[PDB]
Amino acid sequence: KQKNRPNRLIVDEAINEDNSVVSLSQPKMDELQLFRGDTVLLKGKKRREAVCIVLSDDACSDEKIRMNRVVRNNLRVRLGDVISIQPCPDVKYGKRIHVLPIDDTVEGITGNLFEVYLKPYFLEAYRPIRKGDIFLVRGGMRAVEFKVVETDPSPYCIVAPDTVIHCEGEPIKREDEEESLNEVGYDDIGGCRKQLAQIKEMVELPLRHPALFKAIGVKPPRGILLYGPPGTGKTLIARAVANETGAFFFLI
């Protein structure tokens, strides 16, 4: 079976903000035999899957794939990891969905969540979904998460205008496996691109591949000193780096 050359890419940062658009470059797209708007299927770590509409861009390489933080966290991968891509031409429109909120997120929210949040989200935008994911909607000076529990053409479909939604039930608990989305990441840092590039390349090898430094005698850098006027967000950059590499973070 052929899997190495047509079906391998490397995750990196995103430029678009939609939680379903995955951006890649045109040579890979006519190599994969995929056109714009076609729903694609991604497999990552721990046999997790995701369905996403595709899009083309130019400011990419021929092995890099740009995905948003929600879809990336939905596959359990981190930046610099590899995934598998496939065409999925057998998705159908749904006829029944059931969604729940996360209790950690809904606090002091009064009224009904349906007509304020889930009504403008699935409005005039055909969005694909798979059972057991988590998506995020922003508004009312808050950001609320939602977990899909069921799907009528199980286990994945596309949201069509005539797809009823039964938003019935009580909040569900966040388990000890997925991480929160109110945490810090590289997307929550405006400006300062060159310095971010430097720090990212400076801690890439010791924190991503730790076993490599048992096979070579080479000393990686261990002392970093950030400086600048107060109010420039340095602890932010620290927590960001520490969260995106999955490393442990202690604060003195």
Place this chain on the structure above:
Amino acid sequence: KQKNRPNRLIVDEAINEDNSVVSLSQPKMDELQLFRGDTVLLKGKKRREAVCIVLSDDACSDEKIRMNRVVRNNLRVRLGDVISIQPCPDVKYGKRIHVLPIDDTVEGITGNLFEVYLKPYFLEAYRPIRKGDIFLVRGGMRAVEFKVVETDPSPYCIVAPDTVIHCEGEPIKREDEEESLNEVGYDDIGGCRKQLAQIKEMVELPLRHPALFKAIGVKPPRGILLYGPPGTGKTLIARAVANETGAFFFLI
């Protein structure tokens, strides 16, 4: 029943010093069908009532009502609250009243309180009263409070020249519900208007509506630093703010 548009106003600061004059603007006054000098009836928090002569002014909005600190404290409301207004054309002259002092206020006062204090107060000024209120008279380098206990056309009337007063009895105790009137308020701060406006708008939302900051993620200001030469009354301003919002005050 119609109550929202003709019978709702918002309390604010006063410009006059009389304990019976309540000031409002001419559009609301000819909307309520009220003329000058007519006794008006106010209902506030905890089904408290008050009878007051009315007056017109121009430096107001069309939903703000200016009342003195005595009448405001008599309704249990604070600044920025809402009250109900009504016309009360069925007040009559009294024929017997009975008033007592507050023991916390009378200290070292010798002689009789009647002819020195209660004689010039109800002199050539028709003043309305209701049973169970508290009013304040100034003189002799002191300020003495008085509580009405009974009224002959019960439970409210107007003081006419031929209304006898039986100032008979012993001092009464201040209970644990009403606050004193020798405390600090915005009226006891001369000058410094712009800075007062700034500090009042800076602590309005967190201290008046605390539940609102469980429904939005927005950080209110928490650090304030007052400065100026010594002798400019800064702790005064602090106690003032803390008393007018009803907040707890700790002093280090």
